[PDB]
């Protein structure tokens, strides 16, 4: 059961306060994109010398703020997630960071046990999300969402849906919905210790969207070899309206399950 189940995991108490909880996946991979969006970041010095090969990484942690707030198997929690695109090899430019996306959340989560013809709905999570790239104009992007996260498992499968509703200011990128849509779908499949996964969003009206396929395998007890292939719009905020295909290879700690 407790395999990829975020909320139930947060409920399990740690003896050491400095032992964190994983929310999303944690990885650092060496990537190569098909197109490096220069239009958007043109304001930057290095902009011209921008290379199509960046070190991409994602950090993702959850913090239980208050267990049992709404009954047993409930938690008022927070998570922090950060994706970074880093022109590491771009030595002529002093290895700049092209983009970072800071994504903190505040939610009410529940660990559950509903049945769906084989499936079990394990997580039901409802919260506020903020995602900005901490840039001063013009390369500044930001948007906010009220969201619901639902995860269910059934054998080697995991399915998580995340519908959302936009709230707050969207001026840095008013039309962001046109590229992101109204929800995120995520599928994981366990083939032994190999984990195949897919994560995506798609605005069924505008035809815009994006996908991310992944495959990982344990290098050791805690670290995995991870291969990623992103294609489409919205890889990062600064490229939300930019299309691209990105293949990368690197290491991972936790996968979706
Ligand atoms: C975990 C391994 C990755 C190590 C990366 C080194 C830490 C550098 O840190 C990065 O510096 C950038 C420079 O402004 C910031 O934009 C990023 O937000 C920050 O993560
Ligand atoms: C929409 C609000 C999400 C539901 C979360 C509230 C947590 C309740 O918890 C649920 O209670 C059910 C009893 O009816 C049990 O059958 C489920 O296994 C249990 O997870
Ligand atoms: C299901 C409830 C989840 C608790 C979410 C924490 C929400 C606190 O988040 C708040 O949401 C407001 C939206 O009404 C925004 O205006 C505030 O800026 C934001 O801080
Ligand atoms: C638990 C099942 C819910 C899955 C979430 C999918 C809902 C996203 O559905 C979207 O809702 C929008 C709002 O009206 C519509 O404009 C879009 O056409 C529709 O795709
Ligand atoms: C989101 C990740 C993409 C999922 C595609 C993986 C398809 C899994 O495919 C499954 O493989 C099993 C073992 O070979 C078979 O027994 C099942 O019949 C088959 O559905």
Q: How far is Cα 47 from Cα 65, in angstroms, rounded to an integer?
A: 41
Q: Closest-lying ligand to the alpha carbon of 155?
A: 5
Whole-number Å distance, alpha carbon 158 to ligand 5 midpoint, is 12
The annotation status of 140 as a binding-site residue, yes or no, is yes
Whole-number Å distance, alpha carbon 145 to ligand 3 midpoint, is 9
The annotation status of 172 as a binding-site residue, yes or no, is yes
**What is the Cα 5 distance to its own chain's centre?**
16
Whole-number Å distance, alpha carbon 126 to ligand 2 midpoint, is 13
Q: How far is Cα 105 from Cα 127, in angstroms, rounded to an integer?
A: 7
Cβ count near 73 (within 10 Å)? 15
- Residue 211's nearest CA partner among 243, 172, 167, 164 is 243
The annotation status of 94 as a binding-site residue, yes or no, is yes
Q: Closest-lying ligand to the alpha carbon of 148?
A: 3
Nearest CA to ligand 3 atom 12: 128
Our answer on whether the CB atom of 121 is closer than 6 Å to any ligand 4 atom is: no
Header resolution in angstroms: 2.8
Q: How far is Cα 244 from Cα 162, in angstroms, rounded to an integer?
A: 23
Q: Are 178 and 206 in contact (CB under 8 A)?
A: yes
Nearest CA to ligand 3 atom 3: 127
Q: How far is Cα 40 from Cα 63, in angstroms, rounded to an integer?
A: 34
DSSP letters of the chain?
--SS-HHHHHHSPPSSTT--EE-S--EEEEEEES----TTTTTSSTTTT--S--EEEEEEEEEEEEETTTSTTEEEEEEEEEEEEE-TT-GGGTS-EEEEEEEEEEEEEEEEEEEETTEEEEEEEEEEEEEE--PPTTS--EEEEEEEEEEEEETTEEEEEEEEEEES--TTSTTTHHHH-SEEEEEEEEETTEEEEEEEEE-TTT--EEEEEEEEEESSSS-EEEEEEEEES-SSGGGTT---EEEEEEEES----
Technique behind the model: X-ray
Q: Which atom of ligand 4 approaches the CA of 163 most closely?
A: 5
The domain over range 1-257 is classified in CATH as 2.40.230.10: yes
**Which residue out of 100, 139, 250, 251 has the highest number of ligand 1 atoms within 8 Å of its CB and is therefore the one to mutate?**
100
Q: How far is Cα 81 from Cα 256, in angstroms, rounded to an integer?
A: 14
Paired tokens of 232: 């489409």
DSSP letters of 10-62?
HHSPPSSTT--EE-S--EEEEEEES----TTTTTSSTTTT--S--EEEEEEEE
Asked about 132 being catalytic, the answer comes back as yes
């Amino acid at each position: 059961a407790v395999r990829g189940s975020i909320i139930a995991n947060m409920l399990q108490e740690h003896d050491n306060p400095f032992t964190l909880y994983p929310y999303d996946t944690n990885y650092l991979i060496y990537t190569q994109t098909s197109d490096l969006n220069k239009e958007a970041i043109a304001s930057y010095d290095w902009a011209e010398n921008a290379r199509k090969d960046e070190v991409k990484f994602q950090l993702s942690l959850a913090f239980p703020l208050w267990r049992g707030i709404l009954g047993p198997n409930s938690v008022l929690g927070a998570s922090y997630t950060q994706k970074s695109w880093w022109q590491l090899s771009n030595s002529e430019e002093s290895s700049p960071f092209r983009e970072t996306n800071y994504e903190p959340q505040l939610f009410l989560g529940f660990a559950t046990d509903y049945r769906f013809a084989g499936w079990t709905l394990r997580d039901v999570e409802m919260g506020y999300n903020h995602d900005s790239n901490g840039r001063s104009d013009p390369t500044s992007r930001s948007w906010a969402r009220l969201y619901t996260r639902l995860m269910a498992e059934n054998g080697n499968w995991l399915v998580e849906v995340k519908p959302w509703y936009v709230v707050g200011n969207t001026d840095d990128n008013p039309d962001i919905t046109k590229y992101m849509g109204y929800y995120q779908l995520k599928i994981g499949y366990h083939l032994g210790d190999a984990v195949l996964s897919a994560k995506g969003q798609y605005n069924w009206n505008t035809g815009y969207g994006g996908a991310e396929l992944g495959l990982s395998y344990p290098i050791t007890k805690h670290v995995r070899l991870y291969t990623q292939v992103y294609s489409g719009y919205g890889e990062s905020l600064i490229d939300y309206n930019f299309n691209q295909t990105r293949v990368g290879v690197g290491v991972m700690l936790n996968d979706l399950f």
